[PDB]
Every structure is written in structure tokens, then in C-alpha cells.
Amino acid sequence: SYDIQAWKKQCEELLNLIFQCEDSEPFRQPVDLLEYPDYRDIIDTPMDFATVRETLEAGNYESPMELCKDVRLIFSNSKAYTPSKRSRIYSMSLRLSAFFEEHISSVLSDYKSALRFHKRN
Numbered sequence: 001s002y003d004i005q006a007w008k009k010q011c012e013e014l015l016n017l018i019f020q021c022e023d024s025e026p027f028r029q030p031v032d033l034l035e036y037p038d039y040r041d042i043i044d045t046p047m048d049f050a051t052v053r054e055t056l057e058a059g060n061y062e063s064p065m066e067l068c069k070d071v072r073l074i075f076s077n078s079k080a081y082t083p084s085k086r087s088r089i090y091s092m093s094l095r096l097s098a099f100f101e102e103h104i105s106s107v108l109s110d111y112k113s114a115l116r117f118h119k120r121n
């Protein structure tokens with residue numbers, strides 16, 4: 001299964017599943033800085049799933065590892081901003097993280113396998 005390009009469509013499809021999850025609602029667009037005016041005091045690098053999809057479609061990811069870093073930043077930003085570990089929006093983050101990690105594991109393994117096959121000789 002040694003297609004070096006296959007990760008891109010696999011990531012498009014997973015982003016589609018994440019957009020159809022009710023748990024993604026708060027993470028679809030960049031945070032509302034009018035409702036959270038202290039948000040940039042806490043969070044240095046905002047990230048959201050629309051920004052991830054646009055960066056993919058622009059051809060500005062070279063690997064699924066770079067996409068995975070930006071998705072993991074959505075989740076670390078939610079954990080850093082939350083005033084409590086039982087909060088609603090943080091709770092949605094944990095379920096969505098578990099879903100994402102379950103699905104991205106094979107995408108990463110197949111990509112890394114394809115690159116090793118390319119350099120085999």
C-alpha cells in the first residue's frame with residue numbers, strides 16, 4: 001500500500017467526518033475574540049478545523065504529520081483555555097480528540113511505510 005500521495009484524500013475524508021460530528025461545532029471557525037477578549041493572553045497560536053481544511057486544499061501541508069500537529073493544537077488550545085476539566089466545550093474536545101486519534105493512526109502509518117518503500121534501494 002505504497003502510495004506516497006494517498007494521505008491527502010484520507011485527511012479530506014476524516015475532516016468531513018469531523019465536520020458532521022456535533023462535537024466539532026465550537027472548533028469549526030477561529031475563536032470569537034469578542035466573546036473571549038482574554039483568549040490571546042492565554043493562547044499564542046489559534047487553530048480551528050476550517051483553517052486546517054483550507055491549508056490542506058491550498059497544498060500547504062507536505063505530510064499528514066504537519067496536519068496532525070495543527071489538529072492537536074486545536075485540542076491543546078481547548079485544554080489550556082478551559083477554566084475546569086468538566087466544562088462543556090473542553091468535554092467536546094476530548095471526545096473529538098479520541099475520534100481523530102483513532103482514525104489518523106492508519107493514515108500516518110501508511111504514509112511513513114510508503115516513504116520507507118520509496119527509499120528501500
Ligand SMILES: Cc1nc(CCNC(=O)N2CCN(C(=O)c3cccs3)CC2)sc1C
Pocket residue numbers: 025026027028029030031032035036077078079081082083087089090
Ligand atoms: C459560529 C462561529 N464559531 C466561532 C468559533 C467558536 N469558538 C469558540 O468561541 N471557542 C472554542 C474554543 N474555546 C475553548 O476551547 C473553550 C471555551 C471554554 C472552555 S474551553 C473558546 C471558545 S466564530 C463563529 C462565527
